[PDB]
Design a binder for this molecule. Sequence first.
Ligand code: HEM
Ligand code: HEM
Ligand SMILES: CNCc1cc(C#N)cc(-c2cc(C)cc(N)n2)c1
Ligand SMILES: CNCc1cc(C#N)cc(-c2cc(C)cc(N)n2)c1
Ligand SMILES: C[C@H](O)[C@H](O)[C@H]1CNc2nc(N)[nH]c(=O)c2N1
Ligand SMILES: C[C@H](O)[C@H](O)[C@H]1CNc2nc(N)[nH]c(=O)c2N1
Ligand SMILES: [Cl-]
Ligand SMILES: [Cl-]
Ligand SMILES: [Gd]
Ligand SMILES: [Gd]
Ligand SMILES: [Gd]
Ligand SMILES: [Zn+2]
Lengths: 402, 401
Amino acid sequence: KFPRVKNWEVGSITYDTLSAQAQQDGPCTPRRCLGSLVFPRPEQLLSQARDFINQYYSSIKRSGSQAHEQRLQEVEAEVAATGTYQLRESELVFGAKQAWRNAPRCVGRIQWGKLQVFDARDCRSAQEMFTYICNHIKYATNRGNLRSAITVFPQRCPGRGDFRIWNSQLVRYAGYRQQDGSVRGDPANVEITELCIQHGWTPGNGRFDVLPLLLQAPDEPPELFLLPPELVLEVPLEHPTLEWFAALGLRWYALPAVSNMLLEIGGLEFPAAPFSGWYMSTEIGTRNLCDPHRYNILEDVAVCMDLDTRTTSSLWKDKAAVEINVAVLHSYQLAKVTIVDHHAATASFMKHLENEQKARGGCPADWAWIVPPISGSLTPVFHQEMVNYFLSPAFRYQPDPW
Amino acid sequence: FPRVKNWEVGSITYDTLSAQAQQDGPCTPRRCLGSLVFPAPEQLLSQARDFINQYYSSIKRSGSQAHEQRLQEVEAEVAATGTYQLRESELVFGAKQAWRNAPRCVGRIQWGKLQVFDARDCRSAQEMFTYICNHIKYATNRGNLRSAITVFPQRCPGRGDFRIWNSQLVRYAGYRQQDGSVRGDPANVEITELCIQHGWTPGNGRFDVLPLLLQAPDEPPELFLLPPELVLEVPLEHPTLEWFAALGLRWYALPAVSNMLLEIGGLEFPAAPFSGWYMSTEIGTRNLCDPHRYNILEDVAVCMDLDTRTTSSLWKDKAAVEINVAVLHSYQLAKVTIVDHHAATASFMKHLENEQKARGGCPADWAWIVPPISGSLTPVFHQEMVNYFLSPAFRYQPDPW
Ligand code: HEM
Ligand code: HEM
Ligand SMILES: CNCc1cc(C#N)cc(-c2cc(C)cc(N)n2)c1
Ligand SMILES: CNCc1cc(C#N)cc(-c2cc(C)cc(N)n2)c1
Ligand SMILES: C[C@H](O)[C@H](O)[C@H]1CNc2nc(N)[nH]c(=O)c2N1
Ligand SMILES: C[C@H](O)[C@H](O)[C@H]1CNc2nc(N)[nH]c(=O)c2N1
Ligand SMILES: [Cl-]
Ligand SMILES: [Cl-]
Ligand SMILES: [Gd]
Ligand SMILES: [Gd]
Ligand SMILES: [Gd]
Ligand SMILES: [Zn+2]
């Protein structure tokens, strides 16, 4: 009943006893595994609140002692009198760190203890959001010395609309169709780009136009917000030795800040809780720039490198991709913007796994997402067996607000 | 029915084939164990019955006289003997289905083109060896490799199993060294010591081909040396890094898995070696660059003048790419069949599309299908996959020692 977990590079073996605590059923059954699917599809609130409060108090070595029981009664009374409860500041903080710590697909969780939590739970109106989001971005960006941060907007309440950020991230590039359907800019954001335009935004022409924000106060159709350009830190992409690479005109932004995910703590739901860290270079260099449905630049870079693109066995794709990742790391470091390569990132994650084995008896890890999209087996996580499961508190995906 | 998305294209299918998943895998709704490497006549009858139904559907004779004849024949043979024998055509179909059903095999576009050698009359370890040598000779085909399987007698009550103790027909020895290191392939230290313990006179090279340890029923394993001219090998050189040849690296032409169990209609063939041809990343990335295998990555990178003192130079990625280039180039030079990971994953995408039409799905183990370098540069990365167990099947089995 305790999954045996082997590391095949070293031969070491552990048991994931933490998996025994998994709440939300995953997508897999004895009959079929659905682990590669990206998205795999009233007093229930007190059981989740009780569980979260007990978590909080064990983590401060204060289980079964005065303040713990007292806090147990106050949430009991709060839900009894109001049908919900409010998180203590320290709990909201602790829950944010735990949701991050529990994110199975996050390779950066060695950082999970260092998280700046901005409490925007007294927020009201999209204008207020924009200043919170702008405080977050400026704090997180910090002139390129990136700092992990989350801003927690008001929780979900019955019978009243949600706070929602319509953009999937706080910084996204536009995607413009043509007299031929095809896209100039980021093809991933064709939808939100067409929403921003349909809500008043004057579209640009370029391949790297920072989209405006669509911020949704409860029961209000959204409002457009132009992000201050001096607040959107971008990195022009150059290559250390390929002088023509800069002339390709590629850029990427500094701050990866996911703004479409729902933070769930102790049964409470925060559909607006944008979190940010810093990039792993393969996210930009491999996925964003080289995915065929993203900027799809692989062949252009290979033409410029004079690679033989006529045969797949020249591994021209592999070479061009590696140089793109080199350009990303070089450019971010030259711009003094925090970035981590997939080798450092995965080695730190192995350290995270070892810590968590000792601290909690295991670690929910989603192999397909932890292993980087290039050089998978050159990283140690490739050879590490992993167990994937849902712990609470958590970041969950949620439907598009339209 | 699971919904399955391709993210490169946007297309969506439903894996209705998974609903027929026979045996159960390791995952539950509580926890996914997809990443783990190694997760009674009545039930023999139902397995047999289902395989016979599969066979008669393949020959467009489902529900016919011959079909029921075979069902009744097998039921009465199981009643009288506890087991039954496959007809030759059923064995051929069952071996191909087992390949077709192998979720971690990216080469399955080829599944219909499989040469089946019926060695079920095999009598001894000496005859087993001859069959194996003929398999290797046929499959290698002077470098124009041909997919093949040799099926040795099935498990049956009252006699031990035929077993090949080697995990592949061609493996390089791994010698634990004077100072705890391994000379050769560290994956093969165990089988190497077994060969020595069974009378083999070791070498001391890094690429010494292992003898075969062949087990006839209720027999100790018997040592058989492969004639060197049967084992086609490829010296490894790089088209533009002339020092690469001086590494003295080699690999063999024929990937021939010999330790897996073939299961057809409830019958078990513990010895049924099968062989195809390599995908270059198995050699270039895993066998040569895994830290626990030949572990040549840093040595190559140092020779390439890469800056190995910092991970962000991507020296590892650069050196691995050139090792893979060297593998492809060397096998092409030698005129030994090889497929690179771009061509293999593109042909696997066609396999999934063919299988969606033919069967309504395809068991695929994403983490094994996605190559170990350049994952998201291949189309399979962006393909969601459903992993499940269909029979006939190749199964792992315990080592016989
Ligand atoms: C500090 C540096 C960080 C790095 C290098 C990092 C890296 C990554 C990467 C590469 C992914 C894969 C996403 C994809 O490829 O689409 C990911 C996912 C994710 N990360 Fe992190 N991240 C960091 C910080 C954070 C923070 C601060 C949070 C929240 C407080 C967080 C929570 C998540 C979540 C929710 C996901 C989605 C996958 C899941 O829900 O399991 N990460 N991260
Ligand atoms: C014809 C060219 C072939 C190619 C290019 C190919 C490719 C591969 C690769 C790359 C793997 C993963 C191995 C690893 O990383 O350890 C694999 C596994 C496997 N292949 Fe194939 N293969 C071929 C032929 C065959 C044949 C002829 C058979 C059997 C009749 C077969 C059955 C299997 C099996 C059983 C596995 C183990 C995975 C599982 O049990 O699901 N393959 N193959
Ligand atoms: C890979 N680019 C899209 C992306 C998707 C998701 C998710 N879910 C998460 C990230 C992300 C988030 C954070 C905090 C850091 C990071 N390096 N990536 C980035
Ligand atoms: C990748 N090196 C080890 C290896 C393990 C297993 C298994 N199971 C299978 C293969 C293999 C087998 C066949 C027939 C072809 C091929 N390219 N690889 C190779
Ligand atoms: C189909 C497949 O599961 C999907 O493309 C996944 C695979 N692994 C991933 N890993 C990361 N880090 N990010 C991703 O978007 C994905 N996508
Ligand atoms: C632990 C991890 O599952 C393991 O290293 C797997 C991952 N995917 C693989 N994929 C292939 N094709 N071959 C392998 O050996 C492995 N190893
Ligand atoms: Cl991103
Ligand atoms: Cl191999
Ligand atoms: Gd030029
Ligand atoms: Gd040269
Ligand atoms: Gd040397
Ligand atoms: Zn699973």
